Amino acid sequence: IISLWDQSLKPCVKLTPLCVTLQCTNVTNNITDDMRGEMKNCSFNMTTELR
Amino acid sequence: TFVSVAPGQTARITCGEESLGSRSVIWYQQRPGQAPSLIIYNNNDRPSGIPDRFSGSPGSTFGTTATLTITSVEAGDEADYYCHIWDSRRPTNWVFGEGTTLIVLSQPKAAPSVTLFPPSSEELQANKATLVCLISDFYPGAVTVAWKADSSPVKAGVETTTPSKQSNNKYAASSYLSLTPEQWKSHKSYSCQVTHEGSTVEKTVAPT
Ligand SMILES: *[C@@H]1O[C@H](CO)[C@@H](O[C@@H]2O[C@H](CO)[C@@H](O[C@@H]3O[C@H](CO[C@H]4O[C@H](CO)[C@@H](O)[C@H](O)[C@@H]4O)[C@@H](O)[C@H](O[C@H]4O[C@H](CO)[C@@H](O)[C@H](O)[C@@H]4O)[C@@H]3O)[C@H](O)[C@H]2NC(C)=O)[C@H](O)[C@H]1NC(C)=O
Ligand SMILES: *[C@@H]1O[C@H](CO)[C@@H](O[C@@H]2O[C@H](CO)[C@@H](O)[C@H](O)[C@H]2NC(C)=O)[C@H](O)[C@H]1NC(C)=O
Ligand SMILES: *[C@@H]1O[C@H](CO)[C@@H](O)[C@H](O)[C@H]1NC(C)=O
Predict the structure, then answer these.
(1) Closest CA to ligand 1's atom 6
(2) How far is A27 from chain B (nearest CA, A)?
(3) Ligand 2 pocket residue status of A23, Cβ below 6 Å
(4) In chain B, N or C: fewer CB atoms in 10 Å?
(5) How many angstroms separate the alpha carbon of residue A30 from the centre of ligand 2?
(6) Domain locations in chain B?
(7) Strand B172-179 relative to strand B129-136, pairing
(8) Would you say domain B1-105 falls under CATH 2.60.40.10?
(9) List the disulfide bonds (chain A) (predicted).
(10) Given this structure, which CATH class describes domain B106-208?
């Protein structure tokens, strides 16, 4: 199951430039202070089709 | 904002920002000069005294706006309409939804009743003159009033309220004119010329 696992991911997309710093906030809501906000909404700089 | 609907047709009215979550929207019908009357809650649950004509959008939809569906519009339904929005996504709104005036069309026409009143005698001994033209029961409220000094227009002192609807198709407008005691006796007879929609009607008065 492990071998098949890595073999299925060998040709797929690597996120090596997805480690750019992120700028995040809590999600769009009437926050109930108790819930910390399970999701986050984040802007980041990403490289385009050109380097 | 104004909605003009033919009589006996169906009206629709739009309130508030777009939905963000499943909502519970209230609908209020404030009649001109009166207090807001509660019309619909739970987005489609109308209380006692409200016919099944009025409808709404169920607060189960996201992305669409709050809609009020008046079926078989009648003359009494002419009013301002507000709404209170309760989105599961946005904080509690304390500013009610902005208004939307319903206008049933083709009442169609009302001739004004012009009632010219001279100054009162107790006022005459009190050294102040005031003329009271009183325009009632007209439609629509587009009246413009001029005043005449026996044959000549009067420029200053002219006071006139605004055409004000009152729990009826009927409108209302007053017209005061401040005059000096010496000139109510000096001139021959004073004229109130009320112009409405294209018809001018004039009432005059003469001193004793
Ligand atoms: C996560 O965070 C991101 C931030 O990056 C959010 O993305 C933004 O979301 C907001 C909505 O909350 C977007 O703002 C909206 O933009 C629309 C598009 O604007 C274009 O057109 C207008 C003229 O129509 C131009 O002025 C403008 O330059 C753009 O060309 C507007 O149409 C929206 O206006 C509506 O809302 C305002 C709110 O006050 C009303 O007053 C208006 O009348 C109108 O109804 C609005 O301004 C913003 O564009 C998004 N930016 C990006 C980069 O995506 C995500 O929404 C957020 N997601 C979550 C889940 O939190
Ligand atoms: C993402 O890139 C933006 C530009 O697209 C950068 O914005 C700079 O922000 C710094 C402050 O940290 C300012 O001093 C610069 O003037 C900004 N513009 C530049 C450098 O062109 C920023 O580095 C990134 N912002 C994020 C990750 O939130
Ligand atoms: C995000 O949630 C955390 C949860 O602890 C809270 O303390 C913080 O104030 C929130 N930040 C916001 C809403 O900007």
Answers:
(1) A41
(2) 10
(3) yes
(4) C
(5) 30
(6) 1-105, 106-208
(7) antiparallel
(8) yes
(9) 24-42
(10) mainly beta
